[PDB]
Amino acid sequence: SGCRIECIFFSEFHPTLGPKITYQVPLFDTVQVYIITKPELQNKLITVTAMEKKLIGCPVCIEHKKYSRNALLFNLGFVCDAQAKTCALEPIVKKLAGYLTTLELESSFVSMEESKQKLVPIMTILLEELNASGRCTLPIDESNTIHLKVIEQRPDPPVAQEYDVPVFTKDKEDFFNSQWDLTTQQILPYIDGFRHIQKISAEADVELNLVRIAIQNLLYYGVVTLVSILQYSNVYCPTPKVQDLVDDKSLQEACLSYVTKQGHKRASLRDVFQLYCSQFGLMKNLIRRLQKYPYTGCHSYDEICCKTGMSYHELDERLEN
């Protein structure tokens, strides 16, 4: 799950019959919570999100104001626990504030208590459906069907160079062919081809900064970079094996268990480890091709994934070299 919520509440600085009134859907935010957060809920700085700490976690809050005759000022609040990430709720709260604002501006909704009473099962449905699938398609009025979706907000990307080699970790067939951008459809038949100035001028026929920012967005979703597979060692060969030369190094560095100079001892030290903890492919000249030119099933996933479900070996070669 993205984030964990537990309680939603409504509040208002209402006139002299009740100074600060609330509606609640459940934590039970008692007298202490409302005393300890009551100065927060009145400000000339409005239509702005603010979240604060508290004993039970973090409340998030937003306000707005209308009906200056016997002035109207109220507040939505949304309270969760602190010690997690809890940073994917904020445009949803600002969007609900916009929903309530436009609903009041064109229907004159909350001028009477009965509308606010009708507004309570709305809170129940939203409090359940945010935790259900994070999306809400609920018609509250004849002119407002509220639409809500939770974004996981995958974090910040690195910088991509152009001497790089990318590998798509997942498989290609998990997606619609019709549903990509067209530059990505012009590159995606050739991704497992290794280096980048090969791939652009070999099939992409695109511009360098364009494909560099496009692959940076791919890294922002689902691809992992590494360095090229120019054959440095040659004497790694003479221990017998089954087909762990071209694919294995890209896989192992995508699993991030070497230093960059794979050299002439790293691979054999890891190879004998994999061997006991279990003709030519033209072994010279993959590099004269390195410019623009005008078991029986393949085994580089099976044993490594059957390991990778565990973690003792991931200790044993995550303190690698």
Partner: protein
Amino acid sequence: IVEIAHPNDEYSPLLLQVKSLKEDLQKETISVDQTVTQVFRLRPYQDVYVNVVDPKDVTLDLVELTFKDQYIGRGDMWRLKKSLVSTCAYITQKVEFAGIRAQAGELWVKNEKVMCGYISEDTRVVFRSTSAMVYIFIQMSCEMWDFDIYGDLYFEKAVNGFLADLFTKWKEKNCSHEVTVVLFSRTFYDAKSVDEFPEINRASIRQDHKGRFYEDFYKVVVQNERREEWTSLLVTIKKLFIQYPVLVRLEQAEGFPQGDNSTSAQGNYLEAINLSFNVFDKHYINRNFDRTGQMSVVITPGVGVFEVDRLLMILTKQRMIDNGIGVDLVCMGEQPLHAVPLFKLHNRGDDYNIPHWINHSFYTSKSQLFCNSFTPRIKLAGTLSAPPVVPGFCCTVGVDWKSLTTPACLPLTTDYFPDRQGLQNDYTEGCYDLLPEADAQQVFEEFICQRLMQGYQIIVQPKTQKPNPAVPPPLSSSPLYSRGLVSRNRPEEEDQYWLSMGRTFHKVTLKDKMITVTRYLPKPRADEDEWQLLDGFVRFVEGLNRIRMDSPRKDGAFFMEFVRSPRTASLTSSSTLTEILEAMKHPSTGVQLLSEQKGLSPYCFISAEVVHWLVNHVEGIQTQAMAIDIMQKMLEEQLITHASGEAWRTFIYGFYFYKIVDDFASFQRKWFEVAFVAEELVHSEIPAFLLPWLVPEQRTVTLDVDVNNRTDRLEWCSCYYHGNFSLNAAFEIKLHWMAVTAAVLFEMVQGWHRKATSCGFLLVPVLEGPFALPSYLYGDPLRAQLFIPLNISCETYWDRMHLFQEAIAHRFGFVQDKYSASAFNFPAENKPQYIHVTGTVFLQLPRVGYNWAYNTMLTKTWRSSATGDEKFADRLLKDFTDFCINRDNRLVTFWTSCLEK
């Protein structure tokens, strides 16, 4: 000619003006009093000994101005420039030439925006309107219902954000427009079911085996209306977006449906731009008096990719080079990494295509977080070949707000080279010598003879909008149709076109054509004015130039005595056959006879006044025989072959002479309008909104339309006025012209209305769309044809039921809103059409009932306590539906009050 500037020391601004020939400084002034309240205050006297005289050989290469609530033509822009050759230009200047107006703005010189400067003969000009006509379309695809970046939906992003921002900027800059808002989409598998046959097209790839049956759905909101304080349209569009997919889904064919296609799966985009062109091409048929600019905004939530057939693409190219209207924006955000307006050739490596004739822009909301990805994703459960899409520099493109809030008129004077010699084949020249003869219209013979206004060479319009089936979801136009096959046939092959004309005195013009660029050549009236006007009505269509107690006005007297004929409605020994002495001594008392003087009419007396006199003194229906006895000697008109003049309520305008004149054919782009005259009663118009709740046919007058003393040109309009009697029926005047300045004809019609309201009865311009579909010479693709069934629930009986249709028509007359039979002027008058009194409502009378539509040509003026206020038209709609469908006892009492007699 001398040139002054006048700031002081240390200042920020610079102020410069001109007047005539300071050399010795002694006689001078501040040239403008209220330039104080224009710009900057100090006391306006003659002497401060500050003011520096300047040579100022420094120019201002581009100037701009705006118009507000006014119609002109670009020939009037040309003469504005010609009177604007050698003069000053300060910011926010109101200026006037020849009766018409302008307000200055946006004057650049090469890097900088300069507040005050001078313009002479080699700059360039840009004319923009804030009084224009805007057609905004909203595409709806399968991605309007999808979430996006920052967490939002494309619908409320697009509508709420973009339309709210644009309407706030319109309200700030205080413009005025005629809007149309069309919502549209497509559906798939609408194959076969009766009453829904005429609406299906077939998508068809010429080798890969896919051809399916599809349809495009339209729905208009507010049709053609100017109104202040918009943005309630946002609320209506929200409600229609909620009720929209059932309005798409549970209709015509409940087999297997698939609505709301993607933009890249299929698409009806370019077709909608094509029908916007097939509205704007017939803009000349009901010309406005206050609106100039034309703007087609298409909003897509797509990406910039569309796929389309080559044929209609080439067709839209050859139609868009004519006039430039189309502007696209995408409310998706996320500008993608390729040449972003582009087309896949949906033909009959796939073939790629880019347009250069379209202004793209992209929206972005107000939220600021960084790595905005340029990609979608969806999880599954389970012989040139020189352009690709990429190598262009598509970095960042904004909104271009100035090209959105001030629509610009067409380019006047652009750059291309002549057609010297060699391969260029066809040539035609015309020399035109006229004669001293003034017993004006002779320019029309060379006008028809030279080009015939793209006469035999054509502009190519094979878009045949024949069918429109509509649904009774809400009152405006909801058609859902197929737009007819393209009747394409290709024009001219392997040939250019060049013309020339000449007046052998001093004037030559040269004329290149695949686009109409002109090369003018210069060396009782003066011939250069006729030459300039000839260049003007070569421009009018398409005109790219190359660069380096009375008042005896004619119609008004007949109009005011025609007013007098209902103003009073609501002797010696007699029977003597001589009657000569009264026939010349009417004026003994104060008898109104205009027997003094006028041009072309020395001895003025009209026969209706004579009938007034000898019905005050002699009897009434024996009048015509003794009037024949009078007419056997004396005369008023030319030669009789008629009755004794014409006795009661009969209509003769000016121009006594027509016998002892050339015409306008219907295929050389005539500007024409229609005005109608209707009878009002105001003491029921107040309870209309108040608390009570429930002998040839034509005659053609080539009027010289001026109340001024110009000595500039000649300027005339051909009225075709129809009328004969007008007891209580409507009275129509066709207005045709292809001639000189518009706003003077506007103020003549303004004087006609302002004389029609007080001292008489009422005048309103009427849209000449009768109840007529597209694929006509008239017609619009946005007219709903609102049917209303006449429920009943009880020889030659069809005439009888037509009569009682007329009887309930004029009874609906009698309640609040009277009727008039608009027996229109082009012949044979197919179905009875009725205009209602002083309002915006029209009927025709043909299974069950009869059909109804609107006037859009009212435009917040033409106003007394009668007109306007669109809710009145809605009230008449609901009132006739209540009086029509056998409601509670109303048609019951109608049957009793009919059968009582």
